[PDB]
Amino acid sequence: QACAKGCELCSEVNGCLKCSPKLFILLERNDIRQVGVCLPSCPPGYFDARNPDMNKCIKCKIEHCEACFSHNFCTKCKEGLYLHKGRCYPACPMECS
Ligand SMILES: [Cl-]
Ligand SMILES: [Cl-]
């Protein structure tokens, strides 16, 4: 008992579905069935979404994006860039040096 270590909610087929709140679920949609792992931190280019119940790694390979709510779609760009449909756009508010 009870699931892969660190896993709270566990499926015989898809593996972990909800990690304990310490950890971050990574859901690698690997061909073809989906499999979850529980990680202490997310892999490169994943944003780590924290929530009171749970944490999750969300793919966020968006240049100059600070956060993604859902897979590769930015919900907050770095200061001075403009966010439009999940992407980040310069310019660039005194002057722009
Ligand atoms: Cl990163
Ligand atoms: Cl923004």
Domain ranges of the chain: 1-97
Q: What CATH number does the domain located at 1-97 have?
A: 2.10.220.10
Give the distance between the most distant pair of CA atoms in the chain. Answer: 61
- Please list the alpha-helical segments (H only) found in 11-60: none
Question: Tokens 């793919």 belong to which residue?
Answer: 59
**What resolution (Å)?**
2.2
Q: What technique determined this structure?
A: X-ray
Beta strands in the chain (DSSP E): 7-11, 15-19, 24-28, 35-39, 46-50, 55-59, 65-70, 73-77, 82-84, 87-89
| Ligand 2: centre distance to CA 53 (Å) | 26
| Residue/partner pairs of 14-18 with CB below 8 Å, 24 or more apart | 18/54
| Ligand 1: centre distance to CA 1 (Å) | 33
Is 27:36 a contact under the CB 8 Å cutoff? yes
Q: Which two tokens stand for residue 53?
A: 């119940």
Is 19:55 a contact under the CB 8 Å cutoff? yes
Q: Which two tokens stand for residue 74?
A: 């930015």
Rounded to the nearest 5 percent, the helix, strand and coil shares of the chain are 0, 50, 50
